[PDB]
Symmetry: none
Subunit: 75 residues, 6 copies
């Protein structure tokens, strides 16, 4: 004869900007099996494949994925 | 004869901007099996494939995925 | 005869910007099996494949993935 | 004066069971943020959390996630 | 004056069971941030958390995640 | 004056069970940030956390993650 027994007898400050999660990317699972990509750029800008990116700027101009083809100022 | 027994006897400050989740991307599952992409740019801007991106700007102009083809100021 | 027994008898400040997670990317799993990429650039900018990136700027202009094709100022 | 130019001048057996993908699991992205699980088993079987599993059996009985609580044969 | 130029001038057996992908798991991205698990087993079987598993059996009984609580044969 | 130029002038058996990928797990990315686990076993079997496992059996009974709580044969 086999016996198995188990028992459990269980008796019984301002915070102005304190705890903030700001500019956060947490938890990402990405899979790419067969992705062919081909880019031909002539005199401009090309931005591809920007993933899992975070930033926080204070008193400044912040851009994650920005592209400007050309800037010309002549006199 | 086999015996199995189990028993459980269970008896028994301002916060101005304190706890904020602002500018957050959490929880993303992405799959891409066979995605062909082809880009031909001549004198402009092209922005593709921007995923899982977060940011927070304070007193600034923030753009995630912005594209300006050309800027010309002549005199 | 075999016997197995187990028992558990269990009886019994400002924080201005203190604890912030800002500009953070935590938790990323990425797989790429067969990804062919081909880039041809002539006189511009190309930015591809930017992943798991974080930054925090204070009193400055911060850009994660920015591309400017050309800047011309003549006199 | 700036100049950017680009040019591309482009001129120009039985197979009985040969190429089979059988019993395959390819391409899976899974995320679990806050999953609490609690199992209490007394004298039986419990099978949880079986993911991304493949097998191929030839001339045999194959079971991926099978559970039999008890088998009793007395004389 | 700046000049950028680029040019590309491009002119110009039985297989019985030969190439099979059988019992394969290829390509998996999994993330688990905060997963609490608690198991209490008394006299049985418990099988949890079986992921990214493959096998191939020939002339045999194959089980990936099988659980039998008890086997009793008395005389 | 600056000059940049580039040019590319491009002119110009049975296989019974030969090439098989069988019982294979290739390509896995797993992240676990804060996973608490607690197991209490009394007189049985517990199998947890089986990942990235492969096997191939020939003329035999193969089990990846199997658990039998007890086997009793008395006379």
């Amino acid at each position: 004869g086999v016996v198995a027994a188990a028992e459990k007898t269980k008796q019984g400050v301002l915070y102005v900007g304190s705890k903030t999660k700001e500019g956060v990317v947490h938890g990402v699972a990405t899979v790419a099996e067969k992705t062919k990509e081909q880019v031909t750029n002539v005199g401009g800008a090309v931005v591809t494949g920007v993933t899992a990116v975070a930033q926080k700027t204070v008193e400044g101009a912040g851009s994650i994925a920005a592209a400007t083809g050309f800037v010309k100022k002549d006199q």
